[PDB]
Paper text:
The HCV NS3/4A protease – a chymotrypsin-like serine protease – is a prime therapeutic target that cleaves four known sites along the virally encoded polyprotein. The NS3/4A protease also hydrolyzes two human proteins, TRIF and MAVS, which are part of the innate immune system, thereby confounding the innate immune response to viral infection. In this study, we report that four chemically representative protease inhibitors – telaprevir, danoprevir, vaniprevir and MK-5172 – exhibit distinct susceptibilities to the protease variants R155K, A156T and D168A. To elucidate the underlying mechanism by which chemically diverse inhibitors bind to the wild-type protease and drug-resistant variants, crystal structures were determined for 16 inhibitor-protease complexes. These complexes include wild-type protease and resistant variants R155K, D168A and A156T each bound to telaprevir, danoprevir, vaniprevir and MK-5172, with resolutions ranging from 1.10–2.50 Å; S139A protease variants were used except for telaprevir, which requires covalent bond formation with the serine 139 for efficient binding.
Against wild-type protease, macrocyclic inhibitors danoprevir, vaniprevir and MK-5172 exhibited antiviral potencies in the sub nM range (IC50 = 0.24, 0.34 and 0.11 nM, respectively), while telaprevir potency was significantly lower (IC50 = 1030 nM), consistent with previous reports. The acylsulfonamide groups of danoprevir, vaniprevir and MK-5172 were also positioned in the oxyanion hole, hydrogen bonding with the same set of backbone amide nitrogens, as observed previously for the TMC435 and danoprevir structures. Meanwhile the Nε nitrogen of H57 interacted with the sulfonamide nitrogen in these complexes, suggesting that the Nε atoms were deprotonated. In wild-type complexes involving macrocyclic inhibitors, R155 adopted a conformation distinct from those observed in telaprevir and substrate complexes to allow binding of the extended P2 moieties in the S2 subsite. This R155 conformation is stabilized by hydrogen bond interactions involving D168 and D80. Vaniprevir, with the P2 isoindoline moiety, bound in a conformation similar to danoprevir, making favorable cation-π stacking interactions with R155, despite the P2–P4 macrocycle.
Numbering used by the authors: 980 to 1180
């Protein structure tokens, strides 16, 4: 537009729930409904308590996951773009933005818990989805892993930004894209945790 006075601003990313991994059962919890989400995206002021490692996040148009690792809440650029995140004190600007890696990060919210980067060098992995499914994945390269049991891409949609974990529960990567044939995901592409660690320097 040429009329700057009426140009709009995009809202903030808003935390609307979490994937609870604290007990013996993984389950999704919603912490904010759609009306409250819309309001919070506009103001960027979110006073809700944050807990856990894996957050469910939303914009006005999309919903996906974000994962705390080393004191940074990470997600995908294809979901968040350059948006701020809502926080108790107002919008918080990204501390990391890398379109080439499809990676963004903000300082981790107070109350969150961070995963530790994996140093195990192990190839037996576990992908956590927005529905709290824990999907076994065999690592197949730096940024790929195969599903032991393939799934329609519908099952994975909305889980970009979520973690791949090793057997000990360390972060191995951030889910980025599905490797799909005829709508069936046989594998996943992820941003390796080492790439996050390099971004942090
Ligand atoms: C459905 C579950 C998927 C996790 C998910 N992500 C996606 O939907 C991403 C977003 C977009 C497309 N895509 C794919 O997964 C596609 C697909 C299945 C849609 C057909 N696969 C593909 O292109 O494989 C090709 C392959 C060669 C394997 C790509 C590897 C390179 C990957 C790569 C490297 C560097 C930069 C970029 C990329 C890809 N990238 C930018 C980018 O923007 O990708 C999601 O759930 N998104 S979401 O619904 O949460 C959304 C709201 C956030
Ligand atoms: Zn590990």
């Amino acid at each position: 537009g040429s009329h700057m006075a009426s140009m709009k601003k995009k809202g903030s990313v808003v935390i609307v729930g979490r994937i609870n991994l604290s007990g013996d059962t993984a389950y999704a919890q919603q912490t904010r409904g759609e009306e409250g989400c819309q309001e919070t995206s506009q103001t960027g002021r979110d006073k809700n308590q944050v807990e856990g490692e894996v957050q469910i996040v939303s914009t006005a148009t999309q919903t996906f996951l974000a994962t705390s690792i080393n004191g940074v809440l990470w997600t995908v650029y294809h979901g968040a773009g350059t948006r701020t995140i809502a926080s108790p004190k107002g919008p918080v600007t990204q501390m990391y933005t890398n379109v080439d890696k499809d990676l963004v990060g903000w300082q981790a919210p107070q109350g969150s818990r961070s995963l530790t980067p994996c140093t195990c060098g192990s190839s037996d992995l576990y992908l956590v989805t927005r529905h709290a499914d824990v999907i076994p994945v065999r690592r197949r390269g730096d940024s790929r892993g195969s599903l032991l049991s393939p799934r329609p891409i519908s099952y994975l949609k909305g889980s970009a930004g979520g973690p791949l974990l090793c057997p000990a529960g360390h972060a191995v990567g951030i889910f980025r894209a599905a490797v799909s044939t005829r709508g069936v995901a046989k594998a996943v592409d992820f941003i390796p945790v080492e790439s996050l660690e390099t971004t942090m320097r």
